[model samples]
Target: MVDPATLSKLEAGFQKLQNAQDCHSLLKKYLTRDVFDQLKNKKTDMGATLLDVIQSGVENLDSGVGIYAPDAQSYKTFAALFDPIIDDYHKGFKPTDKHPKTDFGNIENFVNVDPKNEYVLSTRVRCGRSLNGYPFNPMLTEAQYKEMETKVKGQLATFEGELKGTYYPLLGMDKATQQQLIDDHFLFKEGDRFLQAANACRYWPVGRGIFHNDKKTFLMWVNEEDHLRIISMQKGGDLKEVYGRLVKAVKHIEQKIPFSRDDRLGFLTFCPTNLGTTIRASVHIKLPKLAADRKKLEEVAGRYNLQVRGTGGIYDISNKRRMGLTEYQAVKEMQDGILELIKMEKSM
Candidate 1:
C-alpha cells in the first residue's frame, strides 16, 4: 500500500495537470486517470518507487520530459503514461502493424559530395540499446553493472578494421584526459542531475566507460542513459559513411550480445521516445542567413521533416524525430533538407 501522504501528493499533482490548459505541457496533455491508476502503486523491477518517476519528470519539467522504466513489467504497466507524449512528439507515430528494421542501404550509392559541405561542420548518427539479460541503469545492482561492463568490453575488444579502438574506464582516469575527451565531444560527462534523480546514477563511475576508434569518429558510451550508445561521427556531412559504420558496428555487437526488443515498441529502451529506430542522426551546420529568421527556418525544416539545433550550441539544426521514420529514411531526409537549406542560403 502507498503511504497516504505520498498518494495525496500524487493526486494533487494530477489535479493540477488536469486543470491546466496548456497544450504544450507534457503532463497536462498525457497524464490521464488511466496513467495515474497504473503507475500510482507500481514499483520497478529493482523496487524503484513510482515517486522516482514523478520526481524525475517534475524536476526536469523544462529540460524536456523523460521517464525510465526498469523492466518489461514496468514498461507494460506505464505504457499509457508515456505513449501519448511520444506520439505527439513523433508526428505520425502510432502503435501499428509496421515494425522497424535496421537497414543502412548501400553506402556506395549515397551522396558522396555536395556544396553543402561548405556549411556543414560535422555529422553524427547514434542509437541506444539495452542488454536483454540486465536490468536498466536505474535498477541495476553494482555487481550486475560491473559484470555488464566486463562482458561488453570483451565484445568490444573483438572490433577490427575501422571500428577498432580502446576502451577508457572512468574509474581512475586523470581529470585532464577526461576533460579533453569531453571537450572534443568524444566522451560523455558524469553527474547529470536528471539521471541522478531518476536513480539511474546510483553506482556512478564504476561500470561506466567510453570506446572510441583511432580517429575518435566512431565511439560507444557504456552505461550512460542506456546500456550502450553506439555512435558514428565525422567532421563533414558524410552521413552514408557515418551511418554505415554505426550499422555495421551495431550488427557486429548484436551478433555477440542480445538486445532487448518489443514487437510494438520495436526496441525496448529505458525511455519511450527512442522506442522505434532508436536512431538520432544529427549534423552541425552553419546557416547564418536561415538562422536569422528562426521561425522561417523552422517552417522550412518542418516541410522537410527536419529539426534545427545550434552547432554544438543551441539554435543550430539537426534531425528531431527518431521514432516515426526508419533510420535510413530519417538520415536521408536530413541530408536532402540540409542541401536544400544550403541552396536557399546561397541565394540570400
Candidate 2:
C-alpha cells in the first residue's frame, strides 16, 4: 500500500492531469518523482489502486495505443504481462511486415526502408505486353478471351442470388447497428463473397477483423443529422475516402431497402490505449557547430517525461516504460512533444 501522504499527493496530481489542456502541461505537473514515489511500491495501497483506476481511464483518452512506438523495448514488459489477456477480450494481432525494394526515378540508390513508402518494388504490379499498332502484344486470342470470361462469370456467381441483392447499410447507424448488419448480411452469406470483396480492395478491413474472428468494419452512417462519419487514427489512407463512399452508398439504398434508424448517429466511444510511458517526445538539439549532443538530448528528454532507448546502462533505458498510464496520456504526451519539436524546428 502507498503511504497516506503519498496517496493524497497522487490524488491531487491525477486531478491536475485530468484537467490539463494538453500532454505537455499534464506531464510537467503529474509525471514526476512525486507520482513515481507513489507507484514504486510493490504493495497495493488505496492510493495505488486509485492510480490504477485513473490509469485505466487514461488509456482510453485517444484512439492510440503505444503499440507501434519506434522504440519497441519500452513496451516489452507491459506487452508480456497484459497484451495476451486483453487481446482475447478485444482483438489483437501484429500486422504482417511488407518490405520491397525502394526506387527513385532520378536519384540513384536512394532506397526506401519504411513499408509505407510508395516506391517499394514488391507492392507495385508488373505487366509484360506491348501497345496496339506497334509491337503491342495485346495477349488477345479467341480462345483466351472465352476462357477468361468463363472464369470471371464463375467467380461472380459466388456472390449471386441473395448476396447480389443484399443491401449493406452504410449510413445512419450506431456501432450496434453496424455490427448487426455485418452479422446478418455477411456472416451467413452464400459463399465467402464478402471476404473476397475485402481482399480485392487495396485497403483490407482492419481493427478486430484481421486480429479476431470479427470480419466487419465499424462505420458510422446517418442521413437526417448528417451523422455519417467514418473514423481513422492514422494520417492518410483509403480508410478516409472509403468511409465517405460507404456512407453515400448506404444513404442511396436507405429507402430502397427495409432499414430504419432508431438512435441518433455520430456517437463517440473510447478505446483502451495500452501504451504507457513509451509515449515519448524527442528534440533535435544543435550542439554548437557539430552533431547532436547526447547529454543535452538526455537532459531535454528528462524534463519532458521522455526517455532515450537502447542506451547501454542509462537509468531511463529500460524495458516496459508505459506500464500504467491513463487512456491517452502516452499518446497525448507524444503528440504534444512532436508539436513542440516542430515549433522548435521552425524557430531554428
Candidate 3:
C-alpha cells in the first residue's frame, strides 16, 4: 500500500495538473515540482501514479479514453485482455473495414511494399499481436533476451533513419507547411476519430520492444505493460534535445483535433475536456518492491478508475491478446477501449 505521505504528494501533483491550462503546462508544472519531489521522497512508484492521474483526467475530458501503451510485456498483457473485447464491441457498430492482419509481411503486401520497407512493422500496427508474448522483465535468458534486443535495435535504426531521411525532413522544413499537412491528416484533425487511425512503432528498449507513439505531431507513451506512462506533450526547454521534445511533438499534433459536443455523454465528442486542456502524459517509474503488493495496488487503481499494469515480466490478464487484426486497428481498438473504461468510471 502507498504510504500517506506519498499519497498526499500525489494528490498535490494531481491538483496541479488538473487545474493547469493545457497539456504542456500541466506537464511542466507537475514535472517541475512533482517529478523531483516524488523522486526525492523515495516514492519512485509515483511515476505510474502520476500517469494514472493524467490518464484519468483525460478520460474525464472525454476524448474517448485517449490512452495506449507500447507492446511492452505488461502492455501486451493489457492488450490481450481487452483489445479484442473492444474490437468486438465495435463489431457491426459502424464504418466497416474488415480487421487486417498485423504482421510485417502482411502489411508490406497490403501497402504494395513501397518497394522499400521504409516503414517499421509492429504487431499492433499490423494488427497481428500487440502482446508479443515475451517476458518484459529481467528474467529472460541471455540468448532469448539478446535476440530481442538485436531485432528491436535494428528495426528502430532502420525506421528512425528512414523517417528522418524521408518524412521528418519535409515536416521539419517549415512550421506553416507542417501545420498545413497536419490540418490535412484526418488522424490529427478528426479529434477522437483519429484514434482508429493511430499507428505506433515498436522498438526494444534493451530487449523490451516498446511501441513508440510517433505520429509526427503528437507523442503519448503507452507501455503495453501498464497504464503508467502516457506522456502527451512537452513542458518546455530545448526542442530536440530533451525527452520533453517528444512530448511537444505529440502536443503539436493534438492541437489539430476537431472537437464537438456529444448529447449522450454531456461533453464534446473528441475529448470530454473539449475546450478544457488535459492530455494524458506520464512515465513509468520501475517499482521492484511493489511486486509483492500488486493486488492491493491494483484494487486501489480499480476504485479510482485507474488500471493496474503488473510488473514488467508478469502476464496481466487485463491487457493481453491473441491476433486477427492490423497494428493500427489493434492500437485504435486498445485506445478506444481504454477510453470506454474511463467513460464508465465515476470521475474523481
Name the candidate that leads on lDDT: 1
Please list the C-alpha lDDT of all candidates, in the order they appear: 0.74, 0.27, 0.29
Model 1: colliding residue pairs: 308-317, 309-316, 309-317, 310-316
lDDT string, candidate 3, 1-348, tens digits: 346765676566456555656554223332434343543233112122223223333333332333332223222223222233234433321122233322212222122111122211111111111113332221233454446445433433343421221222221235675565456341122113223222221232223322333444222222222211223222221112222333333233224322221112111111112111112212122233333466644554344333445434231212222223332333233333333333333231
Cα lDDT for residue 29, candidate 2: 34
Give lDDT: candidate 2, residue 41. Answer: 42
For candidate 3, the per-residue lDDT at 187 reads: 15
Q: Quick one: how many clashes does candidate 1 have?
A: 4
Q: Each model's RMSD to truth, in Å?
A: 3.4, 23.1, 21.4
**Per-residue C-alpha lDDT of model 2 across residues 1-348, encoded as one tens digit per residue:** 456765675567456555756544222333445544443342321112333323422332331221111112212222332233233322332222111221112212111222242211111100011111110001123343333223323322333222232223222335775676566442221113222221211111210110001222322211101112221111112222222223333333332332211111111111122222212212222222111445654555455455544312222221122333421343334334433432443444
**Candidate 1 lDDT (Cα, 0 to 1):** 0.74
Q: Give residue 14's lDDT in candidate 3 (0 to 100).
A: 54
Q: Each candidate's TM vs. the true structure? A: 0.85, 0.20, 0.25
Tell me model 3's lDDT, rounded to 2 decimals: 0.29
